[PDB]
Amino acid sequence: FVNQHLCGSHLVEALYLVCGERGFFYTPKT
Amino acid sequence: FVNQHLCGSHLVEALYLVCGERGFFYTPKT
Amino acid sequence: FVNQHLCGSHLVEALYLVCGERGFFYTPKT
Amino acid sequence: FVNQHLCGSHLVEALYLVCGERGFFYTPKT
Amino acid sequence: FVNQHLCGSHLVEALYLVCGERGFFYTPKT
Amino acid sequence: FVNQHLCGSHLVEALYLVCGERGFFYTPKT
Amino acid sequence: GIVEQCCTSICSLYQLENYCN
Amino acid sequence: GIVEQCCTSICSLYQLENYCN
Amino acid sequence: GIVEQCCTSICSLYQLENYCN
Amino acid sequence: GIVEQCCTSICSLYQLENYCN
Amino acid sequence: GIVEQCCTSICSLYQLENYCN
Amino acid sequence: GIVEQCCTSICSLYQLENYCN
Ligand SMILES: [Cl-]
Ligand SMILES: [Cl-]
Ligand SMILES: [Zn+2]
Ligand SMILES: [Zn+2]
């Protein structure tokens, strides 16, 4: 595939795409 | 605020808005 | 909740979330 | 342009594109 | 209508809106 | 990666993520 | 109204443009 | 759970806020 | 207006309700 | 085609990758 | 191309139709 | 974290899977 800059809501839309039913955590403080 | 009807990626967008820098966890059934 | 920068289409998606059936106005000239 | 089938937040995205700096009003029934 | 800056995923959402069933190509290298 | 259920503009968002700078073509039936 | 029309049936960009300020 | 509730029925922002870290 | 309050600056979800009908 | 498959059934990222330039 | 016309610069909805099939 | 890897820097879809549950 590719590497791009994924920021903000775009980052969590990509995590949704990639993870799906597994679920995911978005933790920007780290 | 009003009640929401959110499916798919729209839930993840809403969580992103609600949580901000706190981030969140997305955990579907199964 | 939190405070973030909401711009462009992201701003009107947040107004949609927050206002829902009430409806809203987006008027950037002011 | 082609005709559109738009629900939820997708309508608000389309209005945003169509109206630009003019902005718009979003007014659902009820 | 208007002219705005349309970039990234926002650009392809606008092409989707505008083209619809015709389909479209997104070719950033040119 | 997980399998996807994507309609409308959500397909175009997924293609955008998958293809990056390569871009893509969107070609619906009919 | 437009909100319902675009979702239960179809609508055009020209009809949407009516809701601009 | 929340994911299913917001989609099959409705949910509030206050319920969503429970899933923040 | 909304742009200055929410994009240029920073706003809460409650301030966003100022632009509801 | 892919547009219809991903919406009426399911599709993979690997199938989508076929539509890149 | 599209990026230069629409992102770097500024384009109308009609110019965007230049990239339809 | 994710922001530094994917927004500030640049990440692949595989690196994004590092944040799946
Ligand atoms: Cl952006
Ligand atoms: Cl949808
Ligand atoms: Zn949708
Ligand atoms: Zn954006």
Which residues on chain F are in Cβ contact (under 8 Å) with B8? 5, 10
Nearest to A12, CA basis, from B24, L8, H21:
B24
In this structure, the number of other CB atoms found within 10 A of the CB of residue L4 comes to: 11
Nearest to B24, CA basis, from I9, C19, A9, J9:
A9
- CA–CA separation, I5 vs A2, rounded Å? 36
Q: Measuring CA to CA, how many Å separate C14 from each of B15, D17, F4, F25, H8?
A: 11, 16, 25, 30, 22
**Sequence letter at residue I19:** Y
- CA–CA separation, D9 vs G3, rounded Å? 10
- CA–CA separation, C12 vs E15, rounded Å? 19
Dihedral of the alpha carbons of E12, E17, E21, E22, in degrees to the nearest 10: -70
> Looking at beta carbons, which pairs linking G4-8 to residues 24 or more positions away fall under 8 Å?
G4/D28, G4/D29, G6/D4, G6/D5, G6/D6, G6/D7, G6/D11, G6/D14, G7/D5, G7/D6, G7/D7, G7/D8, G7/D11
Residue E26 sits at the vertex; the CA angle it makes with B15 and F10, to the nearest 5 degrees, is 30
- CA–CA separation, H11 vs H13, rounded Å? 7
Which stretches of E1-30 are assigned E, i.e. beta strand?
3-4, 24-26
Q: Measuring CA to CA, how many Å separate B17 from each of C8, D29, H15, K2, K7?
A: 14, 25, 13, 30, 25
CB E6 within 8 A of CB K14: no
In the A/J pair of chains, how many CB contacts fall below 8 A? Answer: 4
Counting ligands in written order, the one closest to the CA of D14 is: 3
- CA–CA separation, F24 vs F12, rounded Å? 9
Residue L21 neighbours by CB under 8 Å, 6+ apart: A19, A22, A23, A24, A25, B25, B27
Nearest CA in chain E to D18: E1
Query: In the numeric block, which tokens belong to residue D6?
Result: 């738009």
Contact yes or no, A with F (3+ CB pairs under 8 Å): yes
Counting ligands in written order, the one closest to the CA of C5 is: 1
- CA–CA separation, C17 vs C9, rounded Å? 12
* C-beta atoms of F23 and E29 within 8 A: yes
Query: Phi first, then psi: what are they for C29, rounded to 5°?
Result: -75, -25
CB K7 within 8 A of CB E7: yes
- CA–CA separation, H18 vs I11, rounded Å? 21
Query: In the numeric block, which tokens belong to residue E9?
Result: 């995923």
Q: Is F30 an 8 Å CB contact of chain E? A: yes
What technique solved it?
X-ray
Q: Measuring CA to CA, how many Å separate C27 from each of C18, D24, F5, G3, I19?
A: 16, 7, 35, 19, 9
CB A11 within 8 A of CB L7: yes
DSSP at B4: B
- CA–CA separation, L6 vs L3, rounded Å? 5
CB A2 within 8 A of CB F20: yes
Domain ranges of chain A: 1-30
B/e letters for H1-16, b = 16+ CB within 10 Å, e = fewer, are ebbeebbeeebebeeb
